[PDB]
């Protein structure tokens, strides 16, 4: 009944998802937006919402009375979900309709309102009918169809029937009738060819039941209509198979040159709409009634007609000349129009205005930037559009249409908000006027030659920088002349050996001065000395390697919480790390949010006051989810939440500068959504985890009594003996602590395998973490903190095969069995020479130990009789071809079975 992350906004919708008209008087209209379905009232200026699906919403149809709305989603696990318009918080559902079926790719509901009928996405498609007025949760009747008909993606119900449906693909059309007393659904899908008319007919789009005659209509891209008649069992057939009603292609006629694709029929008119901005109404004779045409309007994909049957004024009225021999009054319902290019309009029934509504991004979507002091947010498409909203007002305001065919993706404000900037996929960069979106530079800057991938301003307005997908950096600077500021190019440099993952500006308050910082996938981090940089010479002076076995993804300033200062970075290991504002060395190991995928990007909520200085919050997105974190991080699951959005992928972040709201832009969903947050709900969730070790104990299997936990605790004592030495004549003594050299031993002893580099990292972490407060190195570590280190450093589950497989797959040939495999001497030599080096005698000792040729423990009694045996054992123990299967049989008696999650918050 309350949530941390609630949704209520939609910007944009996919124009291929057909609109309907519901409540007329107030103007409230229905559109689908990714996995969500939405109602919006123009005059109240408020949205109403239908709450999600397991996948993107695939298809919908509204009852004729606009009381009922039905919807489906694509992908697995699909649900068919039906709704009452005027409760506005309704429910109805069909569970589990199809196991494999990838959601229902077309679906109609009876105007009769008794039945629902559906077409599944599947390699062979399903047809099923559903008595939705009953709480039925299984198909009443079923058929599956040859592939030859193709994707079937239009379906309609017959207003003159209860047991007839039509469907077509691009390339086949189908008639259906359901014999419920027989329990049989029958189909026919006859094949058209040129022979029927010796004429071109080509591809066709939609099919519909005629107004009054035993007929089925099909509309063509060819400018033509096709019509069929149905034939029903002749009486002599009734004694036999009574071959279910057959469809015959009586007639073809050409109605216009231009492509038609829309067809719907209203109150004994037919209505047809075109690729190029002409919409026509007809009487069942196919007689011509006055059309609507040539507005700034095209490829009309959404037609819909009002619930209101028109009352009839005639004393003063505006009606058009019908084209009858006389030409009479003509009064449609009100009706809705919308284009291909996502342009939404309502018509006054009397024609006196063609009124347009919201207008929205055509195609694919990329993430939005907020003004830092004003309730303004800027949205941009790939195509031709950047536009700004006041997200409190929900009002569409200033926008500029951009030059044709340039792709655009990156957007930024400068820290003042006075400037806006955008990045264009064809080698192109603009600076923009945070008012008029004038091209500030008389020409844009077009120095690079492929897609941007980041842009950012310095704290100084005078400097801006971008990344490009060629892994090349570029920087931008202001020059002061004549009392003017002008913007000017600054010089490119290639500094990353893999895809760039973040780009950042930095301040030297130490000198009130600007800094430039870049995150690559190459595990390398760099800073550039702007103040020494010069033309054709970005001054590169600092490279760090910052990840291992993995790669980083995001870079931001950590907020000030400390004397020290940090950058925050995240990696494919689900790890987060802090690096030092001077040395960029590491000391923090964190476990990222468990939620399904690694973090893609994070942004930090703004500060008003000391009250925020007392309480800081971090926002992040992953592949498919958006989530919140309270600082400091410690990997506690209760400390974090994440929620699912546009679940074919999310691609950027933006935050309301008041600190109330966040906005997510998807991609192919063409949709942007606002999110409204309760922090106290997360404080409550934190309280669910309790305090002290309780969360971390909960992370250990069996917590404080699990046999694992006791097994670990012994190693603390055993390693304490090792630190004392096994041989001593004194009293034994132990207390609270192990000495850091033992810590790698204990960590391995539990079952996690840090590299030498990881060891160095952890020793740095322990030494330095206390350092700045104490002034001191410290080297006695206590169990509770060691446990925290393990829990952060460990693989985010049990140890996994996957990296082993990947390593063999890189190193090995595919063998006779194709298995990725390594030859024994090559394998040995590589293990000595490469990676981290091994001494030959060291490696031989290791193998002899693993095979168990030595005496055990290697820590009290001598051995040297053994080692000569291992020389021959290197041949005799190791097979000539080695594989992950063999190597894991040698290393592992542990069957490292797979983890599970579903209960975890």
């Amino acid at each position: 009944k309350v949530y941390p992350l609630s949704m209520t906004w939609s910007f944009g919708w996919n124009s291929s998802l057909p609109v309907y008209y519901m409540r007329e008087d107030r103007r409230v209209i229905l559109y689908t937006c990714a996995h969500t379905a939405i109602m919006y009232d123009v005059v109240r200026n408020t949205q109403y919402h239908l709450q999600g699906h397991p996948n993107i919403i695939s298809c919908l149809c509204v009852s004729e009375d606009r009381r009922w709305i039905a919807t489906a989603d694509e992908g697995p696990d699909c649900l068919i979900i039906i709704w009452d318009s005027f409760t506005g918080i309704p429910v109805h559902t069909i569970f589990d309709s199809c196991p494999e079926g990838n959601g229902m790719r077309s679906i109609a509901i009876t105007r009769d309102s008794k039945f629902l009928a559906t077409i599944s996405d599947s390699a062979t498609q399903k047809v099923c009918i559903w008595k939705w007025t009953l709480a039925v949760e299984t198909p009443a009747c079923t058929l599956e169809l040859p592939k030859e008909y193709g994707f079937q993606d239009n379906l309609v119900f017959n207003p003159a029937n209860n047991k007839e449906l039509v469907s077509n693909s691009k390339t086949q059309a189908i008639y259906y009738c359901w014999f419920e007393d027989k329990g049989i659904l029958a189909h026919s899908a006859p094949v058209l060819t040129e022979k029927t008319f010796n004429k071109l007919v080509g591809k066709f789009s939609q099919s519909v039941f005629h107004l009054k005659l035993p007929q089925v209509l099909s509309a063509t891209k060819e400018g033509k209509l096709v019509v069929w008649d149905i034939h029903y069992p002749s009486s002599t057939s009734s004694s036999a198979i009574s071959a279910f009603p057959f469809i015959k292609p009586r007639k073809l006629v050409h109605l216009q040159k231009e492509a038609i694709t829309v067809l719907m029929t209203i109150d004994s008119y037919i209505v047809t709409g075109d690729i190029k901005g002409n919409i026509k109404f007809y009487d069942h004779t196919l007689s011509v009634v006055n059309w609507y045409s040539n507005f700034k309007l095209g490829a009309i994909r959404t037609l819909s007609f009002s619930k209101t049957i028109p009352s009839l004024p005639t004393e003063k009225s505006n009606l058009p000349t019908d084209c009858t021999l006389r030409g009479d009054l003509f009064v449609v319902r009100n009706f809705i129009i919308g284009t291909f290019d996502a342009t939404v309009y309502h018509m006054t029934v009397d024609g006196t205005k063609l009124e347009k509504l919201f207008v929205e991004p055509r195609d694919a979507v990329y993430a939005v930037s907020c003004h830092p002091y004003q309730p303004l947010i800027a949205v941009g498409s790939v195509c031709g559009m950047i536009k700004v909203w006041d997200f409190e007002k929900k009002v569409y305001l200033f926008s500029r249409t951009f030059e044709k065919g340039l792709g655009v993706q990156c957007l930024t404000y400068n820290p003042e908000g006075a400037l806006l900037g955008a990045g264009f996929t064809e080698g192109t960069v603009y600076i923009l006027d945070a008012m008029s979106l004038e091209n500030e530079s008389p020409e844009p800057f077009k120095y690079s030659k492929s897609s941007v991938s980041h842009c950012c301003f310095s704290h100084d307005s005078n400097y801006m920088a971008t990344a490009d997908v060629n892994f090349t950096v570029a920087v931008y600077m202001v020059v002061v002349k004549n009392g003017q500021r002008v913007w000017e190019y600054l010089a490119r440099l290639r500094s990353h050996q893999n895809s760039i993952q973040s780009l950042l500006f930095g301040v030297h308050l130490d000198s009130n001065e600007p800094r430039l910082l870049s995150l690559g996938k190459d595990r390398f981090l760099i800073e550039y000395n702007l103040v020494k940089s010069c033309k054709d010479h970005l001054d590169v002076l600092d490279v760090h390697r910052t990840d291992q076995g993995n790669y980083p993804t995001c870079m931001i300033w950590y907020p000030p919480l400390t004397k020290e200062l940090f950058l925050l970075i995240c990696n494919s290991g689900y790890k987060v790390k802090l690096f030092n504002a001077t040395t960029k060395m590491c000391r923090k190991t964190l476990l990222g949010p468990a939620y399904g995928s690694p973090i893609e990007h994070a942004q930090v909520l703004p500060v008003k006051s000391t009250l925020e200085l007392q309480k800081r919050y971090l926002v992040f997105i992953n592949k498919d989810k958006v989530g919140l974190q309270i600082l400091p991080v410690d990997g506690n699951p209760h400390k974090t939440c994440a929620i699912v959005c546009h679940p074919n992928g999310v691609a950027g972040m933006a935050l309301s500068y008041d600190g109330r709201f966040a906005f997510t832009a998807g991609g192919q969903d063409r949709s942007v959504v606002q999110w409204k947050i309760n922090l106290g709900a997360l404080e409550a969730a934190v309280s669910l985890g309790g305090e002290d070790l309780t969360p971390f104990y909960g992370l250990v299997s069996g917590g404080r009594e699990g046999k694992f936990y006791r097994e670990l605790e012994d190693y603390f004592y055993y390693s304490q003996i090792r630190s004392q030495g096994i041989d001593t004549m004194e009293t034994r003594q132990v207390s609270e602590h192990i000495c850091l050299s033992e810590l790698p031993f204990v960590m391995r002893a539990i079952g996690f395998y840090p590299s030498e580099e990881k060891i160095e990292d952890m020793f740095n972490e322990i030494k330095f973490s206390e350092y700045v407060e104490t002034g001191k190195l410290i080297d006695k570590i206590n169990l509770p903190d060691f446990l925290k280190v393990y829990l952060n450093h460990r693989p985010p589950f049990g140890n996994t095969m996957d990296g082993i497989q990947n390593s063999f797959n890189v190193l090995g040939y595919t063998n006779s069995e194709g298995k990725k495999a390594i030859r024994r001497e090559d394998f040995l030599n590589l293990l000595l020479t490469k990676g981290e080096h091994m001494t030959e005698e060291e490696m031989i000792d290791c193998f002899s130990t693993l095979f168990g040729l030595t005496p055990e423990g290697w820590k009290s009694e001598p051995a040297a009789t053994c080692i000569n045996g291992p020389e021959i054992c290197l041949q005799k123990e190791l097979p000539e071809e080695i594989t992950a299967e063999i190597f894991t049989t040698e290393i592992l008696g542990l069957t490292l079975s797979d983890s599970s999650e579903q209960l975890i918050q």
Binding site: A418, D433, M435, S436, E438, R485
Partner: peptide, 20 residues
Amino acid sequence: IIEMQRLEIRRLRDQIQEQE
């Protein structure tokens, strides 16, 4: 006139930057 407003806004914020 809009461009003149942008120019005047620029001049005024530069004058504040001089006051800064």
